[PDB]
Amino acid sequence: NSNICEVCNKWGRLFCCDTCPRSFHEHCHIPSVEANKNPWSCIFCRIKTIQERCPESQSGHQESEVLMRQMLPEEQLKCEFLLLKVYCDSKSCFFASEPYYNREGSQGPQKPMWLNKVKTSLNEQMYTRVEGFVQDMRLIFHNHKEFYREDKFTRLGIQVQDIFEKNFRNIFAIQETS
């Protein structure tokens, strides 16, 4: 097993996956690491098993169809993994916790959003469709773009949204296009 958390790349109190070499802090893993379960398989392993059980699940899909899916167990898991993949980028620290807005010449967004809130929402089963999760994720970066305007700090929004979008296309097997 690894000696650092796969998500935040620090040492500490780590839980080890029994079926791959990754390790996690308790609350870096999504969902949080389960109390018992021996053996324990992490989210990367669980996502790999889905693919192996249904190899056709990797054929191309339309984004519009993916968004309308109901949050059954397997879509729930995919959304948790996609959220995890964003937290894996150290630039997610800017979007994790509840933001505030007091900048000359800007007004704050009508509907603030942050990664920990989406985390909570997923954990409490508040999303009924994939569309709900994806809207809130994209709202995070859109609020950032709009508020920071021509400050070069807007680029953090672009960069973390690219991580999100690439991972979304990968995890939900969106049809490749030019």
| 43 forms part of the interface with Zn ion (CB under 5 A) | no
Q: How far apart (Å, rounded) are the C-alpha atoms in residues 86 and 69?
A: 21
If the CB atoms of residues 15 and 127 are measured against Zn ion, the closer one turns out to be: 15
Q: Which stretch binds Zn ion (CB under 5 A): 23-31, 100-108, 137-145, 155-163?
A: 23-31
| 5 forms part of the interface with Zn ion (CB under 5 A) | yes
Q: What separation in angstroms does the CA of 108 have from each of 18, 101, 116, 147?
A: 45, 5, 19, 6
If the CB atoms of residues 17 and 134 are measured against Zn ion, the closer one turns out to be: 17
> Residues 50, 74: contact at Cβ < 8 Å?
yes
Position among 15, 17, 86, 113 found at the interface with Zn ion (CB under 5 A): 17
| 47 forms part of the interface with Zn ion (CB under 5 A) | no
What's the CA angle centered on 117, arms 112 and 118, to 5 degrees? 100
> Residues 161, 136: contact at Cβ < 8 Å?
no
Position among 16, 31, 45, 163 found at the interface with Zn ion (CB under 5 A): 45
User: Using CB under 5 A as the criterion, which residues of the chain lie in contact with Zn ion when the complex forms?
Assistant: 5, 7-8, 17, 20, 25, 28, 42, 44-45, 54
